[PDB]
Amino acid sequence: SWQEKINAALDARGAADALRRRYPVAQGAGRWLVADDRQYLNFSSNDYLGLSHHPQIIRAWQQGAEQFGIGSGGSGHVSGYSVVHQALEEELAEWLGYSRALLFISGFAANQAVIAAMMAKEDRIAADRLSHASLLEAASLSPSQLRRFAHNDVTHLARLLASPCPGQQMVVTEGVFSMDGDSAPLAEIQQVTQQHNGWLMVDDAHGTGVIGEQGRGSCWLQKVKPELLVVTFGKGFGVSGAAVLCSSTVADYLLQFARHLIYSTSMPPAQAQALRASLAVIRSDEGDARREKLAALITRFRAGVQDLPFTLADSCSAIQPLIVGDNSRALQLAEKLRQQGCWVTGIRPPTVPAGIARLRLTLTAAHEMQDIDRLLEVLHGNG
Numbered sequence: 001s002w003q004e005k006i007n008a009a010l011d012a013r014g015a016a017d018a019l020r021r022r023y024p025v026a027q028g029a030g031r032w033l034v035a036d037d038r039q040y041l042n043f044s045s046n047d048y049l050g051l052s053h054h055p056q057i058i059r060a061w062q063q064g065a066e067q068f069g070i071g072s073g074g075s076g077h078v079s080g081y082s083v084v085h086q087a088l089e090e091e092l093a094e095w096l097g098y099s100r101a102l103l104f105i106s107g108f109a110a111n112q113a114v115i116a117a118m119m120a121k122e123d124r125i126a127a128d129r130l131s132h133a134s135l136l137e138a139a140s141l142s143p144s145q146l147r148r149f150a151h152n153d154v155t156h157l158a159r160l161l162a163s164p165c166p167g168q169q170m171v172v173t174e175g176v177f178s179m180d181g182d183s184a185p186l187a188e189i190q191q192v193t194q195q196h197n198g199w200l201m202v203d204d205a206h207g208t209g210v211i212g213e214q215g216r217g218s219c220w221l222q223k224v225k226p227e228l229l230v231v232t233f234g235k236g237f238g239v240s241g242a243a244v245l246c247s248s249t250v251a252d253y254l255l256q257f258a259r260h261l262i263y264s265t266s267m268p269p270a271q272a273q274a275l276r277a278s279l280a281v282i283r284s285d286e287g288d289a290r291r292e293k294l295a296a297l298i299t300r301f302r303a304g305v306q307d308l309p310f311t312l313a314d315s316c317s318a319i320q321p322l323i324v325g326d327n328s329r330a331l332q333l334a335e336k337l338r339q340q341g342c343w344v345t346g347i348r349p350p351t352v353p354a355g356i357a358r359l360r361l362t363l364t365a366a367h368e369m370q371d372i373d374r375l376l377e378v379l380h381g382n383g
């Protein structure tokens with residue numbers, strides 16, 4: 001029956017331990033986290049540049065409501081395509097060096113929309129084994145064939161691409177990977193993709209706004225232009241939403257065949273104004289100051305772990321894995337940190353293999369050096 005199907009599934013998830021439970025917060029973005037009315041240093045949010053609380057972005061969101069009301073009133077294909085949406089798209093395309101940008105209500109929707117629209121049963125997706133679930137889920141449901149290459153292994157990628165394919169091939173990777181914060185070798189990946197006549201799709205959720213000139217992200221920094229670039233605004237941008245960057249004809253195509261685009265309500269124009277505001281901060285001298293402050297905090301953090309009984313990742317970004325090893329020690333550590341006013345998130349098997357449990361820390365430009373020093377002190381020992 002249905003209920004038994006439900007029940008058994010929750011039971012298998014329990015047995016694998018794997019149970020998830022949301023905790024409500026009064027504040028969850030930026031330097032602080034407030035839970036159960038207690039203040040904590042927040043090392044668990046994706047607000048990498050501290051923009052969620054930025055007064056210019058807050059005011060754009062507020063004035064945009066005065067000017068446009070709240071809901072757009074419809075899809076972008078009927079009465080919901082605002083002059084603010086259009087301006088935001090044009091400013092994103094110009095920023096990142098593409099012909100067109102298309103807005104989406106979430107990065108998860110944009111990824112899923114692109115793949116559903118572009119990939120046919122004859123085609124192949126070659127995706128990094130560690131790609132975001134939205135990408136892999138979508139690639140899996142797709143009628144097209146899905147092959148994974150070992151993480152960042154371009155030799156393995158070239159072999160996948162070289163295998164006979166009845167249709168077209170799309171390579172997919174991240175500019176900065178979600179789990180370990182490492183970067184993909186985009187220039188070599190792009191070379192072998194072109195060698196096999198494929199196209200490249202890069203998801204730069206963790207790179208966008210945070211690295212490269214004017215924060216343009218991983219592709220710009222590495223002087224690669226993939227055919228498809230997906231940027232999401234729920235992280236560094238400090239808001240929510242996403243864009244697909246692409247050529248004129250691919251944009252026209254998505255406008256015809258991406259159903260998330262055709263049959264979904266567009267975002268509130270006041271959300272779009274906050275995103276334009278966010279983009280303007282990111283591109284500005286203050287954007288540069290925030291990125292350099294983030295880099296300074298990361299340096300301070302990685303230096304201080306050198307004396308600690310833990311290990312770091314190959315990450316130069318806001319994502320800073322602290323590898324602990326054992327799942328009980330990792331859980332203990334995070335619980336001790338919490339008692340001591342530092343809110344962290346532990347990642348343990350099975351999400352990661354056997355003996356690699358960890359805290360996945362995230363730093364932000366809203367933090368201060370004394371916050372890193374407090375984290376380091378508690379990691380050391382004191383309470």
Ligand SMILES: *Cc1c(COP(=O)(O)O)cnc(C)c1O
Nearest residue numbers: 106107108132178203205232234
């Ligand atoms: C967060 C995440 C997204 C999902 O974007 P949302 O706007 O949060 O839906 C896509 N890709 C990567 C690599 C991400 O980490």
